[PDB]
Amino acid sequence: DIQMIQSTSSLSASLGDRVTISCRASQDISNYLNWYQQKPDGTVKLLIYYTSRLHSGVPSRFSGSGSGTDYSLTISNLEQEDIATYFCQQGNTLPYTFGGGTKLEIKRTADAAPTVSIFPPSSEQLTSGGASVVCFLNNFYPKDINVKWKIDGSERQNGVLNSWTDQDSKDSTYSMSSTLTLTKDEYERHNSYTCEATHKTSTSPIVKSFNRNEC
Amino acid sequence: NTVIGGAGDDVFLQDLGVWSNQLDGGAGVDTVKYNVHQPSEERLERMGDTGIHADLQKGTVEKWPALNLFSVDHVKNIENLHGSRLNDRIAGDDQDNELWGHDGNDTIRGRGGDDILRGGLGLDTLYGEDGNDIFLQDDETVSDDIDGGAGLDTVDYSAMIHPGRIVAPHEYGFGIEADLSREWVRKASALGVDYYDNVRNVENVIGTSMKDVLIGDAQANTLMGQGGDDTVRGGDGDDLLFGGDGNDMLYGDAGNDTLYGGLGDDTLEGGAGNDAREHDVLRGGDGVDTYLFGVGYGHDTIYESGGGHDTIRINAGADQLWFARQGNDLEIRILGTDDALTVHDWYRDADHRVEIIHAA
Amino acid sequence: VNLVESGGDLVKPGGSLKLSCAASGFTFSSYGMSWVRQTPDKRLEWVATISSGGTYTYYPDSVKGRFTISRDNAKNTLYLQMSSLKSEDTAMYYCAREIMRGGGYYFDYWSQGTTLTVSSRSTKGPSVFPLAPSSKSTSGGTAALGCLVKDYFPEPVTVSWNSGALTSGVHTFPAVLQSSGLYSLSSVVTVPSSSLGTQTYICNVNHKPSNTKVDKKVEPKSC
Amino acid sequence: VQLQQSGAELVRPGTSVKVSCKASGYAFTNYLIEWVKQRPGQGLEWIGVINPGIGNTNYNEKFKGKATLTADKSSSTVYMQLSSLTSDDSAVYFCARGLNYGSSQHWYFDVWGAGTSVTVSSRSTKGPSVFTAALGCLVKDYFPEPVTVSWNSGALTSGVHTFPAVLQSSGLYSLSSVVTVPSSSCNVNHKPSNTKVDK
Amino acid sequence: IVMTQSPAILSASLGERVTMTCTASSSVSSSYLHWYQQKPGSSPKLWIYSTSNLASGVPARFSGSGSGTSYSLTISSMEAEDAATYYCHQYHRSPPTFGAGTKLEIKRTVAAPSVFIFPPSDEQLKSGTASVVCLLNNFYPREAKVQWSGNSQESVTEQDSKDSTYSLSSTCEVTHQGLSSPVTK
Ligand SMILES: [Ca+2]
Ligand SMILES: [Ca+2]
Ligand SMILES: [Ca+2]
Ligand SMILES: [Ca+2]
Ligand SMILES: [Ca+2]
Ligand SMILES: [Ca+2]
Ligand SMILES: [Ca+2]
Ligand SMILES: [Ca+2]
Ligand SMILES: [Ca+2]
Ligand SMILES: [Ca+2]
Ligand SMILES: [Ca+2]
Ligand SMILES: [Ca+2]
Ligand SMILES: [Ca+2]
Ligand SMILES: [Ca+2]
Ligand SMILES: [Ca+2]
Ligand SMILES: [Ca+2]
Ligand SMILES: [Ca+2]
Ligand SMILES: [Ca+2]
Ligand SMILES: [Ca+2]
């Protein structure tokens, strides 16, 4: 079958920047090349069909070009609403194959330091027989961040679940949750629980701790 | 009131009166017409948009359906019928009928035989039924519903583009865009609005004098682009592709296809098998024609004349090419493959020769 | 132009499911319609197209013999019957309108996605635990509080705050597959610290697979 | 000029029935025949029209598939099929002479037939039960209408008020006959049951 | 096209002038508007055809007028033989449509009903069935009210050819125009 290759899987660019996303077909697709935009909420919209024809309601800062096997999507003035994943697709021959997609994120014009919160296991969860320590890191940039858990000073790696929000559509910042899952009996055998965050915005890590025996 | 036609082609202008008439066309091809008389003011008051209910097989034309059952034209040996400017229900016989709906939203069924159906202006529902039927379409944005039925049927869009002012828009630069594989035809196009026909069980499409897109289905199709630079894709099955005048692009796709570039500088591609049994006939005709060939295309044959600068484009490196004489033919093989491109009678004389090859 | 998909559910390997797509805003019977699916790796894949009259159906090799696309032009509905389902069929399923122009095809309008989960694991409703605001989650006039939606299957769950009256400063994280095979996520909202004593905060959790509706009230931790 | 219709028809719910309308006294193939439905105590509903010359027909849309008209030019007779009979089809059916094939056309129904009573029901033939001042009788249960009530061998006909029969929920019929008598001072007959009661 | 007749019931004393109307949802031609008369137990008869022409045997006191959507039938002097139901009929367009009908009755001086009760027969109670009969005799107008719910069936006779009264039975509080207050029996 015809393979659609987008060399870039993810890229970050600034507001007002000119952004180009490339697409390559394994065969000549005779300009039958379409571009689709998937917003972070999952909705899919057609931007361009037939290499360069703009769909109705698509802003004129979107453009397409190419021929043969090489095709390009161009955003002339990157805007904040353009955070999305962009797919190419050939409509020449069955099956109508899609490119792997290119996730586009805003390169923020300033870094943002994380604010860190820690939530001990809920009284309701402990009563039900579980234990989850939740570390909440909020409104930071860039997305890269390292989280280290310590139980009574000793580092704990197993049972840690990490999750990130999509880039904030307005602030262009990221949020993160690190959840340390423990058996309820093991949680009540130790007292000190520490969440350590390392981020570009500080050479010293952010330390957030609580003591199970201190309210 | 009785009317007997002669042995030749006769045309009977029939009004929508309330009396009962007897019509016999006799020998020859004979037509009754109901679109010349102006419908009376009383009939417009009481009949509204309802036209005639005509059944050539039953031999009756009801001029006042429901309201006056006496008002019936009894016909025999009449092959063709033309409807009214109102909504008609027309049914042919098992003979070859020409059935025109004219204005109004008409339902027309041809029954057996090779019929010619022309809905005319309006929202028309056209059944070809048994036999090889032809559907003549007209310059209009209003949608039509065409069912070819059994047999080899043809929808014809020549009348989309005519001398004088053209009503329907064609702002994308195309006459029609026909997709038998999806069972519709884009008959007209403007900025932000499209106009489609529903076409089912129709095997053949005749284009306009402008650029057309003609896409076939899995059956054996005959697609004729006519004037303008056309784009024709036959799809699966053994298709017959006609470029006509202009610089056309013909793709046979899978199946054993036959491509006629016609006049002009045409690009002919026989295609590749979908899965050995892939033999395409490429006849670029007059003009500077380009033939496409590649791995998996099978054994295709070029027929040329006039000895021009026709070119061959092969999706393979030049050092992969292998030339061999076969009788009087030149045979271009791709090394490592069973694919072979034959130029018919290449060695007989210069007229049949193709001497320019673009390689990848 | 509007396309409303429905029918996604959890099915054990080898089972069947039928999705529907209700169309409106255009002449449904003039257009070829299609289904497109998105696998967890975010890759998109065309899975079926049907002709406007329903005579012709087209499928990729990956679903041929197992999927059947059909349409009811009288009811403006498109269907996709699936059988012999495998784990590889787990995806978000979209229904789209197909267009041909100049010889090539594209999809000009899409529905939203519906979730097909192919797994032998049984449906489990989540437990909802409050993440109470405290001195350890309060700094600079802002307090963080939230809800822990733990140990459920399959996806998805929806979370709102105060029945949709609190939409600003909400961080509902993507679920994480735990080693137990069950999902878990948290929703954390940032509010002003002054409001902790006078504003009640409630998270609403919906897990339609298990018919679980939970309104958890998140109270501040006092010392 | 008259239109002779068929006799009363009592049939089972699921069956069909033909009713005839024989014409006489005029050129049969020069007048359209129309059919009208009248439910007990209801208005007039147009069924359809037939051209007896060619067999051409047109129907009310709500009777398409239920009514079917045919004509026999040799016998000068017009027929009507009722298919898939229902309690909502129990009515009187009239045939009327309609449009003339001529120069003066006005589309009126000038000659009407007597009407063919069609009553469809699941019940079977059943016999009646019998139960100043005023006395009276009571006929509680009988299905094949009608009964005739007379008082004192018809010698008494003043003050008598025999009421119209009423269809009870069970499917049979009932009525009451009453005579007003001086303060100082009953023959029932049901044909289909051959039951005659005097009290 | 949709025929509406007014009124549903028309009451007229002897010698009184009578006018009933029939309106169409759309304009119909006078040539294709007809009237029919029907009495109980008989077929309808053509009465007035093409708006204003009397059929054969119709007395000269009948007349009809109208155009467009508004048509009427008039009797210049009410007679007992005129009491019937009158249907207007359009054939301006197909399918032809009839009106709901106007029941023309004879108006009379108000006559109060005579009420009687009949307990269930011991012959009837042998079969375990109990039917109680209430009788209203020789009353006018027809409109009455009889309550004892859902376990009774009413029945009224035709207007009497002699005294123009009605008789009703229900199988007992009675409310009627002639009764200054409901009479129980
Ligand atoms: Ca002739
Ligand atoms: Ca002839
Ligand atoms: Ca016509
Ligand atoms: Ca024919
Ligand atoms: Ca035919
Ligand atoms: Ca027409
Ligand atoms: Ca047409
Ligand atoms: Ca045919
Ligand atoms: Ca055919
Ligand atoms: Ca053309
Ligand atoms: Ca051409
Ligand atoms: Ca084909
Ligand atoms: Ca082919
Ligand atoms: Ca050409
Ligand atoms: Ca081929
Ligand atoms: Ca040529
Ligand atoms: Ca040539
Ligand atoms: Ca080939
Ligand atoms: Ca040449």
Automatic annotation (TrEMBL), chain B:
It is found in: Host cell membrane; Secreted. It comes from the Bacteria. Residues 329-357 form the Haemolysin-type calcium binding-related domain. Coiled coil: none annotated. Hemolysin that forms small cation-selective membrane channels, leading to hemolytic activity. The hemolytic activity of CyaA is weak compared with that of the HlyA of E.coli. In the C-terminal section; belongs to the RTX prokaryotic toxin family. This is Bifunctional hemolysin/adenylate cyclase. The gene is cya. The chain holds residues 1056 to 1659 of 1706 of the full protein.
